[PDB]
């Protein structure tokens, strides 16, 4: 036993590497960035028919122009999402403008590595967050997707998958992704790929999908709108 | 029991199964790492401290090699043990003495200063996060009612007033020498004779340091080489 801020001989923080291992236990989430908008899609991973599927939220609205898909330890993600929300509203309060997707991601990523046990203020964070995040949104740079992991590294991505089946899903995303791809193609592609990589047979109640478009605010798809896109299978 | 150990009782100041504090016992061994011995004796008229002055090098400025310290103008001190620890305990003593005078309007009694330093050492024997200081302090001064005083405290937080005493590598041999001498019914002579016997050296005046306080001249005084020489010469002629 050793402290939460110990480096390994390879130059990584044990706790961060281990938090990255927790992401591999999460459900798969997919993001795709097109010139017409970004879409976020996530495997819900229903563990019983008694569970209400709509009470699983893994895509969340940050602001009207920004959504967030998460994988890993879901409870950990709450404080990050709240922080993203509060930051975008603070930016709006002060500057009377919308915050960029990259700025929101950056602010959240600055919380990654703020854990420890002797510097330590309240009972502030004792360990890293076991979460990866995809922030998808629209600002004046146009449509944009960013990925963040527990190390605080964040980066823009044309398409990205996270969670258990991300290696495979990412391989399928390299194959289908092109820059001139439409949003409706990107939606179908991501559903096709979730279908492959999911352990449960895909249907309209065990996935979630959301978009953000230049024209339009963050939109979570309904059972009915999902059924429409599921028909192509 | 008999040298038994459980848990962390050799690493921090917790009780061993016998009720011992091994870390405190080890602080006593740290005292002997310096390799020096110190002696102090009290008469009716004066109190004296003598210690070894080892200057192997001579690239050293020998005026800065000393274990004799002024605490107040009337309180002197010899430190035996780890040097930096010793210096720290001297600062604390100076601070305690100045503060006493500020609050109470009269010079700290030697017994009170010693007690205070011992009470502070005690805290390190009971709180796990710091070590004891590996050092021993002997204090001399004149009290207005009791006369000359010598006091010693140690890393266990024990303290006492003495007729004579010693510290460091040859403590037990100096104690025996002083015991057989005190058992019968000149204070600087006794101190330097004791030290010279137990080390078997017969000193040059630059190989010891001597500090005194007297009823007539209560200001702590450090002897010069010449003054020490005059005592060494006076002993040599028996």
């Amino acid at each position: 036993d050793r402290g939460v801020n110990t480096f390994s001989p390879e130059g990584r923080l044990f706790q961060v590497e281990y938090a990255i291992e927790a992401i591999k236990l999460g459900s798969t989430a997919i993001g795709i960035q097109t010139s017409e908008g970004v879409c976020l899609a996530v495997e819900k991973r229903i563990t019983s028919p008694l569970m209400e599927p709509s009470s699983i939220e893994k895509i969340v609205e940050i602001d009207a122009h920004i959504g967030c898909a998460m994988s890993g330890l879901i409870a950990d993600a709450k404080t990050l999402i709240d922080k993203a929300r509060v930051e975008t509203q603070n930016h709006w309060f002060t500057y009377n403008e919308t915050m960029t997707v990259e700025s929101v991601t950056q602010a959240v990523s600055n919380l990654a590595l703020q854990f420890g046990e002797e510097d330590a203020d309240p009972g502030a964070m004792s360990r890293p967050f076991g979460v990866a995040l995809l922030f998808g949104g629209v600002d004046e740079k146009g449509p944009q997707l960013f990925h963040m992991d527990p190390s605080g590294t964040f980066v823009q991505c044309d398409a990205r998958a996270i969670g258990s089946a991300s290696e495979g899903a990412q391989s399928s995303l390299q194959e289908v992704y092109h820059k001139s791809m439409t949003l409706k193609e990107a939606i179908k592609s991501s559903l096709i790929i979730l279908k492959q990589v999911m352990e449960e047979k895909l249907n309209a109640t065990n996935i979630e999908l959301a978009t953000v478009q230049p024209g339009q605010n963050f939109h979570m798809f309904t059972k009915e709108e999902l059924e429409e896109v599921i028909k192509d299978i | 029991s008999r040298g038994s150990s459980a848990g962390f009782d050799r690493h921090i100041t917790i009780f061993s199964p016998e009720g011992r504090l091994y870390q405190v016992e080890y602080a006593f061994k740290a005292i002997n790492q310096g390799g020096l011995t110190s002696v102090a004796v009290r008469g009716k008229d004066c109190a004296v401290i003598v210690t070894q002055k080892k200057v192997p090098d001579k690239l050293l400025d020998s005026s800065t090699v000393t274990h004799l310290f002024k605490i107040t103008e009337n309180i002197g001190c010899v430190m035996t043990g780890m040097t930096a620890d010793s210096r720290s305990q001297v600062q604390r003593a100076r601070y305690e003495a100045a503060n006493w005078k500020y609050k109470y309007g009269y010079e700290i009694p030697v017994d009170m200063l010693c007690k205070r330093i011992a009470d502070i050492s005690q805290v390190y024997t009971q709180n796990a996060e710091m070590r004891p200081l590996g050092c021993c302090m002997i204090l001399i001064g004149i009290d207005e009612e009791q006369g000359p005083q010598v006091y010693k405290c140690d890393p266990a937080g024990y303290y006492c007033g003495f007729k004579a005493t010693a510290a460091g590598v040859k403590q037990t041999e100096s104690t025996s020498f002083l015991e057989k001498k005190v058992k019968k019914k000149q204070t600087v002579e006794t101190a330097i004779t004791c030290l010279s016997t137990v080390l078997s050296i017969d000193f040059k005046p630059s190989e010891i340091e001597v500090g005194v306080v007297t009823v007539e001249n209560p200001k702590f005084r450090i002897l010069t080489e010449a003054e020490i020489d005059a005592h060494l010469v006076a002993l040599a002629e028996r």
Binding site: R2, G3, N5, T6, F7, S8, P9, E10, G11, R12, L13, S109, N110, A112, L113, G116, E117, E118, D119, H147, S151, G152, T153, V155, Q156, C157, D158, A159, R160, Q170, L173, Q174, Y177 | -
Partner: protein, 236 residues
């Protein structure tokens, strides 16, 4: 093992393993090169892309008009340090109405990063910086480390396979002081290109350049803006 988990435990060889292990974070970052002439300081960096669809990682950050940095090691520590540096530069302009001298900023980094190397439960910063600046004493290239030590450099390279860059920089450093700016950047790029596997080449996707000097505020060049520096093309 009993000496390698705490920055407050000296080993019997007079080492602190946690600091050495933090230094491995920087050896594993992608390489960057720093060099200077009489008039300019330039940074050049290789950016990694986690996949083909990911964007290449930022390696070069603006600190003030007269200072920029290149990073290797944990990005999050790089951002925290860069924010500290930015703040010290603002403070100095607030108080004195003049740029903070580069050597004084580097000292401040040394003090700040040394602190956690001596306290229980804290850790070194796992980031190494190359710092390009210009002030009254002319161009500078400094290097900072997880040990909190820092160095003033004619040129330097850090990160993976940077030993190759170092060897190129030594070979040509007697030329640097009198290079015009294009020559100097060409030198940086060649040193960086030595760190690359024989198959791999410098592209506009993977090179980032930072420049400051007598005529020029700290400026960052990415993507289409590095093309003028790459052609260029001395080698073979």
């Amino acid at each position: 093992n009993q000496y390698d988990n705490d920055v407050t435990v000296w080993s019997p060889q007079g080492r602190i393993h946690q600091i050495e292990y933090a230094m491995e974070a920087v050896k594993q970052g992608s390489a960057t090169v720093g060099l200077k002439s009489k008039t300019h300081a330039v940074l050049v960096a290789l950016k990694r892309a986690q996949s083909e669809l990911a964007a290449h990682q930022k390696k070069i950050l603006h600190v003030d008009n007269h200072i920029g940095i290149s990073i290797a090691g944990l990005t999050a520590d790089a951002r925290l340090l860069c924010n500290f540096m930015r703040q010290e530069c603002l403070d100095s302009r607030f108080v004195f109405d003049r740029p903070l001298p580069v050597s004084r900023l580097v000292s401040l980094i040394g003090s700040k990063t040394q602190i956690p190397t001596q306290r229980y439960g804290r850790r070194p910063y796992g980031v190494g910086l190359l710092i390009a600046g210009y002030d009254d004493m002319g161009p500078h290239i400094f290097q900072t480390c997880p040990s909190a030590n820092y160095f003033d450099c004619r040129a330097m390279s850090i990160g993976a396979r940077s030993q190759s860059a170092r060897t190129y920089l030594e070979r040509h450093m007697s030329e640097f002081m009198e290079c015009n700016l294009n020559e100097l950047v060409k030198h940086g790029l060649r040193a960086l290109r030595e760190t690359l596997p024989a198959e791999q080449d410098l592209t506009t996707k993977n090179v980032s350049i930072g420049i400051v000097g007598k005529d020029l505020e700290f400026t960052i060049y990415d993507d289409d803006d590095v093309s003028p520096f790459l052609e260029g093309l001395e080698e073979r």
